[PDB]
């Protein structure tokens, strides 16, 4: 329940293949920047750096937690449905 | 009449019964008047 992970914009690379080592099993790849992530201060940064080395990008907005309205009386309502039945 | 200080009188609660409050709440109610609504006959309605 920590928002400290979600205020910094990141840039990273498609998955590709992940196949399975044939004498121990272990998880193979061939995609070298596949665990290489950019972190980045604002979504316009992250643009001029994809655009700096020519990667294709497809920017996704940043979602914020919508402003809600809490309020402990109406856990205790006396004419409406908010009244808990239970504490 | 000569204030006899030195008796109790409270026992009539001796002679209660398992009931007796609920009992006695019961035909108490006709003295009662129109308890007030809320509206939804429950909060989950």
New interface residues.
Partial sequence: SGVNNTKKWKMEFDTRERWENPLMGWSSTADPLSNLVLTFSTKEDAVAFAEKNGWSFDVEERKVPKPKSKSYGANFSWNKRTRVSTK | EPFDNSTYRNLQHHEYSTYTFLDLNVELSKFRMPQPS???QS???
């Fill in positions: 809320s509206g939804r909060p989950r309605h």
